[PDB]
Subunit: 80 residues, 2 copies
């Protein structure tokens, strides 16, 4: 069972699996979560800010997080 | 540069563009679910369902790994 099917590029999840499958094809790894998280959070923050015209309050409300959390993530990726 | 399909991030951007055209207050959780689930699937597949090895590869403790698995009903 999967949460939703509203993210397609077909489903986004399929793209994540292939990227991981391709990655595994090549070896110790110890930061795969952060690796994936950063690769997904950056584009998400970018698109949400574009959709909301950089209105941080609107962006956080759309994402379902508070203002401070959004700003923290934005800073992490030098997007502040 | 390590996660490609080309970079994975480009697929996330396109996915969101398509989604926005269909229009919300749970976008973060919604995307996290679509990303974490497959990640957990692939790592557990890679380690033959060995949670310790999976947790170590991901860089999270075993307790956190098990919490995520449960969150997504992957017990």
């Amino acid at each position: 069972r999967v949460n939703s099917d509203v993210l397609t590029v077909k489903p986004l999840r399929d793209s994540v699996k292939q990227a991981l499958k391709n990655y595994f094809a090549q070896q110790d790894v110890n930061d795969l979560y952060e690796l994936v998280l950063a690769e997904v959070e950056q584009p998400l923050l970018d698109m949400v800010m574009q959709y909301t015209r950089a209105n941080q309050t609107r962006a956080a409300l759309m994402m379902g997080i508070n203002r401070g959390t959004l700003r923290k993530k934005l800073k992490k990726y030098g997007m502040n």
